[PDB]
Design an enzyme around this catalytic site. Structure first.
Site, PDB file in Angstrom:
ATOM      1  N   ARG A 122      23.774  25.301  60.382  1.00 36.26           N
ATOM      2  CA  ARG A 122      23.530  25.920  59.496  1.00 36.26           C
ATOM      3  C   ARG A 122      24.693  25.796  58.113  1.00 36.26           C
ATOM      4  O   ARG A 122      25.596  25.185  58.370  1.00 36.26           O
ATOM      5  CB  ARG A 122      23.721  27.444  59.827  1.00 36.26           C
ATOM      6  CG  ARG A 122      24.931  27.953  60.551  1.00 36.26           C
ATOM      7  CD  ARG A 122      25.069  29.503  60.619  1.00 36.26           C
ATOM      8  NE  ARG A 122      26.190  30.012  61.224  1.00 36.26           N
ATOM      9  CZ  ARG A 122      26.270  31.421  61.508  1.00 36.26           C
ATOM     10  NH1 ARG A 122      25.527  32.024  61.358  1.00 36.26           N
ATOM     11  NH2 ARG A 122      27.613  31.640  61.992  1.00 36.26           N
ATOM     12  N   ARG A 159      28.796  30.997  51.514  1.00 35.54           N
ATOM     13  CA  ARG A 159      28.508  32.282  51.189  1.00 35.54           C
ATOM     14  C   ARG A 159      28.294  32.532  49.833  1.00 35.54           C
ATOM     15  O   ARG A 159      29.007  31.823  48.799  1.00 35.54           O
ATOM     16  CB  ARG A 159      29.541  33.302  51.592  1.00 35.54           C
ATOM     17  CG  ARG A 159      29.501  33.425  53.387  1.00 35.54           C
ATOM     18  CD  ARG A 159      30.665  34.598  53.554  1.00 35.54           C
ATOM     19  NE  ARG A 159      30.829  34.455  55.201  1.00 35.54           N
ATOM     20  CZ  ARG A 159      31.866  35.039  55.834  1.00 35.54           C
ATOM     21  NH1 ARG A 159      32.661  35.685  55.153  1.00 35.54           N
ATOM     22  NH2 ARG A 159      31.916  34.757  56.986  1.00 35.54           N
ATOM     23  N   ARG A 181      38.529  18.720  75.642  1.00 31.98           N
ATOM     24  CA  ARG A 181      39.776  18.665  74.654  1.00 31.98           C
ATOM     25  C   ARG A 181      41.026  19.515  75.205  1.00 31.98           C
ATOM     26  O   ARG A 181      40.652  20.634  75.557  1.00 31.98           O
ATOM     27  CB  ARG A 181      39.406  19.036  73.407  1.00 31.98           C
ATOM     28  CG  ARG A 181      38.095  18.203  73.003  1.00 31.98           C
ATOM     29  CD  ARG A 181      37.767  18.423  71.423  1.00 31.98           C
ATOM     30  NE  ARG A 181      38.364  19.638  71.051  1.00 31.98           N
ATOM     31  CZ  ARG A 181      37.855  20.401  69.984  1.00 31.98           C
ATOM     32  NH1 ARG A 181      36.559  20.381  69.629  1.00 31.98           N
ATOM     33  NH2 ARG A 181      38.630  21.364  69.613  1.00 31.98           N
ATOM     34  N   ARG A 213      46.255  23.739  61.795  1.00 31.29           N
ATOM     35  CA  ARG A 213      46.447  24.998  61.324  1.00 31.29           C
ATOM     36  C   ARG A 213      47.877  25.567  61.854  1.00 31.29           C
ATOM     37  O   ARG A 213      48.364  25.171  62.740  1.00 31.29           O
ATOM     38  CB  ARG A 213      45.256  25.925  61.575  1.00 31.29           C
ATOM     39  CG  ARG A 213      45.210  26.265  62.831  1.00 31.29           C
ATOM     40  CD  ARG A 213      43.852  26.856  63.331  1.00 31.29           C
ATOM     41  NE  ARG A 213      43.353  27.008  64.803  1.00 31.29           N
ATOM     42  CZ  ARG A 213      42.142  27.152  65.020  1.00 31.29           C
ATOM     43  NH1 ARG A 213      41.234  27.335  64.293  1.00 31.29           N
ATOM     44  NH2 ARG A 213      42.058  27.140  66.365  1.00 31.29           N
ATOM     45  N   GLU A 242      49.377  23.912  65.358  1.00 29.66           N
ATOM     46  CA  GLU A 242      48.041  23.480  66.432  1.00 29.66           C
ATOM     47  C   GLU A 242      47.888  22.319  66.169  1.00 29.66           C
ATOM     48  O   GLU A 242      47.418  21.756  65.152  1.00 29.66           O
ATOM     49  CB  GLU A 242      47.033  24.626  66.354  1.00 29.66           C
ATOM     50  CG  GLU A 242      45.858  24.506  67.253  1.00 29.66           C
ATOM     51  CD  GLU A 242      44.802  25.237  67.228  1.00 29.66           C
ATOM     52  OE1 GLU A 242      44.964  26.381  66.969  1.00 29.66           O
ATOM     53  OE2 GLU A 242      43.506  24.848  67.372  1.00 29.66           O
ATOM     54  N   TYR A 265      32.349  26.726  76.679  1.00 27.79           N
ATOM     55  CA  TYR A 265      33.211  27.628  76.023  1.00 27.79           C
ATOM     56  C   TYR A 265      32.421  28.830  75.848  1.00 27.79           C
ATOM     57  O   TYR A 265      31.520  29.158  75.688  1.00 27.79           O
ATOM     58  CB  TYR A 265      33.484  27.080  74.451  1.00 27.79           C
ATOM     59  CG  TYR A 265      34.181  27.885  73.547  1.00 27.79           C
ATOM     60  CD1 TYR A 265      35.437  27.695  73.779  1.00 27.79           C
ATOM     61  CD2 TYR A 265      33.726  28.878  73.029  1.00 27.79           C
ATOM     62  CE1 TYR A 265      36.325  28.645  72.966  1.00 27.79           C
ATOM     63  CE2 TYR A 265      34.114  29.992  72.274  1.00 27.79           C
ATOM     64  CZ  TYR A 265      35.642  29.589  72.105  1.00 27.79           C
ATOM     65  OH  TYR A 265      36.640  30.774  71.491  1.00 27.79           O
ATOM     66  N   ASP A 320      33.548  32.658  74.202  1.00 26.23           N
ATOM     67  CA  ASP A 320      34.265  33.931  73.394  1.00 26.23           C
ATOM     68  C   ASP A 320      34.488  35.007  74.582  1.00 26.23           C
ATOM     69  O   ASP A 320      33.665  34.945  75.670  1.00 26.23           O
ATOM     70  CB  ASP A 320      33.229  34.394  72.174  1.00 26.23           C
ATOM     71  CG  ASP A 320      33.521  33.737  71.045  1.00 26.23           C
ATOM     72  OD1 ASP A 320      34.722  32.823  70.880  1.00 26.23           O
ATOM     73  OD2 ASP A 320      32.704  33.715  70.195  1.00 26.23           O
TER      74      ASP A 320
END
Ligand SMILES: Cc1cc2c(cc1C)N(C[C@H](O)[C@H](O)[C@H](O)COP(=O)(O)OP(=O)(O)OC[C@H]1O[C@@H](n3cnc4c(N)ncnc43)[C@H](O)[C@@H]1O)c1[nH]c(=O)[nH]c(=O)c1N2
Ligand SMILES: Cc1cc2c(cc1C)N(C[C@H](O)[C@H](O)[C@H](O)COP(=O)(O)OP(=O)(O)OC[C@H]1O[C@@H](n3cnc4c(N)ncnc43)[C@H](O)[C@@H]1O)c1[nH]c(=O)[nH]c(=O)c1N2
Ligand SMILES: O=c1ccn([C@@H]2O[C@H](COP(=O)(O)OP(=O)(O)O[C@H]3O[C@H](CO)[C@H](O)[C@H](O)[C@H]3O)[C@@H](O)[C@H]2O)c(=O)[nH]1
Ligand SMILES: O=c1ccn([C@@H]2O[C@H](COP(=O)(O)OP(=O)(O)O[C@H]3O[C@H](CO)[C@H](O)[C@H](O)[C@H]3O)[C@@H](O)[C@H]2O)c(=O)[nH]1
Ligand code: NA
Ligand code: NA
Lengths: 386, 386
Positions: free
Chosen positions: A175, A179, A256, A287, A312, A363, A365
């Site tokens: 997608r 914004r 990973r 980051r 990281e 993965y 959440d």
């Protein structure tokens, strides 16, 4: 018996299954955990010097639009009103992020209205048509144009995957990442927050039930023959690695991993924001997290002159390295459904269920792990325990 | 009697006093309101073409750190989780606002850390010492330096006050307007939100009590002799203009007024954010409000192709103009305490209490109006009604 159910692993999946069995079916649950602490990868702890809460296995931001999961987790902890926001470091400037009117103004040099920004993005991205994109680089350029792709996507993606974007599947962008307003809330979900007393207290409250026993520093594969002998009828929910269960009889699933470098600095404020993405190739890390800013409500309990930060780094996981994200090469995928059928045989032959991030090579959440556990509870374990 | 208390005005002050008398003392309350609607200046209504809620007397954002007031207002309405954020338009760029690391990066051209930004501001502002500042311009420059002052403060302030900043008192800036992080929450308070069903529903619920009667389109000064004759013992809480009560026997108190120009546009999104400040002198208006963005939770009930905006202009108030902000010239101040002693005599002689924004010549945030009413209720009206 001493237990009616054995749960291998004390992460969110295991804890959810355990707590439901304990409190809803009134069953005795034995939880077996290999590490020294409860909670799996959502576990957090104080940094000894500052006292600041740090997430041990990556920053963990809780968010969901699943009301059932939201109601559930609020039994065990309250949540702050924290809203996650991210900034993006590119050529010595912090950009508003994700891509939206803010970034667009900063990067193209002047204010674009919603409608002007839509037009700009149509122009920039006109070069490649999305249906004709062959890899990740092209697919991205087809959506947002070359300038945006090259400043904010290319090197970041390269660092995370340790791979040139031209060598990644087009299917990995689905997608438009842009914004057309000034809304820089990182997440889109109805409910969002951080556990008021931290993750460790939350996970711990889940295990805190008269019917639940927890054995830390205990490897399932070393105690299993003994435990099942005590009550052969008790089912097992297994949330450890799927391939390791079957002794890598189909070879090792690819992951990973992440390396975290955690420093205490002699300043009260390193970057004035929780998460700063580093989008340029010159920085090895993807980051930097500054953990005091995850909990601004605790400011007068935080040191005024010190702060904890954590850089990281992403790379492929070698033996012993913590598994974080599944890689999902086609080799990995085929290896997986071979294991899936092993697992299903094991359930019908051994009353051993497979679940969780490791148990299913996935993965998830946190709200997805919980949802998935609630579902295994409702559609399998209820029956399996009567 | 038909009433035990008369309240003049149906704004938040009046409504709070009325509701407390009605529900806590079980008294009958007659509320007299001059306009055609309830709620005073917090009143809002749908725009006829789009249906979008617009605030008739200025944008109204509710925020407080007063828990008592917060608990109180939640009896009459629920609040959304809206957090107010503002952007600042300067030379064709939308700046993050208020002044903080975001603005600083955008305006000085590269990222400053908290500590670097502190140092930058120390340098920029070193020119004038705060104790030596004689007017508004200098006082501002003494705090943030000339570049920031001239881009974001000077013309905005000039437009609002219709006055050169060099001709304004230094006392009108009391603290450093600069944040040394990336936090752009406009307000600092514990509680913040917008009434879920709009302001009109909220104010209306306050008046909705078996003991409360409301007479709209009724001027106190035309009906007072008649009403008090029906129950001479009933006290009056007066929230209309203080000087008008005493027939301007000490002359007219000075006010700033506001003109609002409200347009329906044939686009779904004009600026992608609720409030855009216009900091340059070339624009006559101080800011533009786009009201659909105050209530993003109502998006699928908003037109997809249309939007309401409202430009705000500031000027001194002439006769008939709505009074908004007190000016507080020293002439005004002396005129005021002359009226204060008139008022206090009137209370002891006539059982007429003065309160509210108009009744006391004051600017009050909504939670302050409510707090002030709760206090007049507790420390005066309870006694005055036994
Ligand atoms: C880097 C990173 C960052 C994030 C996230 C993931 C990752 C990888 N998450 C996702 C979150 O971590 C995830 O939802 C939960 O860890 C899932 O919990 P599980 O129970 O599935 O496994 P999990 O890995 O947490 O727990 C399994 C447990 O089993 C134990 N175990 C393994 N083998 C064993 C054996 N043989 N015997 C005994 N014990 C054994 C392990 O020690 C572990 O405690 C996240 N989610 C989100 O919603 N927001 C976020 O911001 C983040 N952040
Ligand atoms: C431009 C602007 C913008 C804002 C705000 C103010 C202004 C000026 N406010 C503040 C808010 O408007 C304020 O707190 C309330 O209006 C105070 O309510 P009062 O009851 O004191 O007076 P208010 O003026 O509201 O009500 C008095 C009432 O008495 C009536 N009346 C007068 N004379 C009469 C007579 N003779 N007979 C009968 N009726 C008579 C009037 O018609 C009116 O309804 C605000 N606050 C905040 O917290 N956040 C915000 O974002 C804003 N926004
Ligand atoms: O500045 C950026 C950020 C992201 N990406 C692209 O977006 C992908 C995914 O981005 P991130 O992994 O940084 O962020 P996610 O939103 O996908 O996930 C984040 O939020 C999750 C919570 O649901 C976990 O916390 C996770 O570890 C954290 O990275 C990247 O691989 C890359 O292709 C960019 O190009 N530039
Ligand atoms: O971009 C800006 C904004 C403000 N100012 C200075 O700050 C003063 C006050 O600013 P605003 O009046 O715009 O904002 P406030 O925070 O003081 O008050 C705002 O919030 C209030 C709610 O408590 C009301 O909604 C009010 O009408 C609305 O202006 C201005 O006169 C000016 O001196 C600037 O120089 N530049
Ligand atoms: Na395209
Ligand atoms: Na100074």
């Amino acid at each position: 018996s001493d237990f009616d159910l054995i749960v291998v692993g004390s992460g969110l999946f295991g804890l959810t299954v355990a707590e439901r069995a304990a409190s809803q079916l009134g069953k005795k649950v034995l939880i077996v955990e290999k590490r020294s602490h409860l909670g799996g990868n959502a576990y957090s702890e104080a940094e000894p010097e500052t006292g600041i809460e740090i997430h041990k296995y990556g920053a963990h931001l809780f968010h969901t639009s699943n009301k059932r999961v939201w109601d559930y987790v609020n039994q065990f902890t309250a949540f702050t009103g924290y809203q996650h926001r991210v900034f993006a470091m590119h050529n010595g400037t912090a950009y508003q992020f994700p891509m939206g009117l803010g970034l667009i103004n900063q990067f193209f040099g002047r204010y674009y209205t919603p409608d002007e920004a839509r037009e700009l993005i149509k122009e920039q991205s006109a070069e490649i048509d999305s249906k004709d994109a062959t890899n990740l680089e092209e697919k991205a350029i087809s959506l947002i144009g070359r300038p945006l792709y090259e400043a904010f996507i290319r090197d970041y993606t390269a660092k995370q995957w340790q791979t040139d974007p031209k060598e990644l599947p087009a299917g990995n962008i689905t997608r438009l990442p842009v914004r057309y307003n000034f809304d820089n809330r990182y997440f889109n979900d109805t409910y969002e927050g951080l556990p008021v007393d931290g993750y460790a207290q939350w996970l711990s409250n889940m295990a805190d039930h008269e019917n639940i026993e927890v054995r830390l520093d205990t490897d399932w594969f070393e105690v299993r023959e003994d435990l099942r002998a005590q009550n052969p009828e008790a089912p097992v929910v297994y949330t450890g690695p799927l391939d390791r269960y079957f002794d890598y009889s189909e070879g090792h699933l690819g992951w990973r991993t992440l390396d975290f470098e955690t420093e205490v600095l002699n300043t009260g404020d390193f970057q004035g924001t929780p998460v700063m993405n580093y989008n340029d190739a010159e920085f090895p890390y993807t980051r930097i997290h500054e953990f005091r800013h995850f909990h601004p409500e605790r400011e007068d309990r935080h040191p005024k002159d010190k702060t904890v930060i954590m850089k990281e780094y992403s790379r492929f996981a070698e033996e012993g390295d913590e598994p974080y994200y599944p890689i999902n090469t086609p080799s990995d995928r085929e290896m997986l459904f071979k294991y899936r059928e092993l697992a299903d045989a094991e359930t019908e032959s051994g009353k051993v269920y497979f679940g969780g991030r490791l148990g299913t090579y996935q993965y998830l959440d946190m709200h997805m792990a919980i949802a998935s556990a609630l579902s295994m509870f409702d559609n399998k374990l209820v029956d399996a325990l009567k």
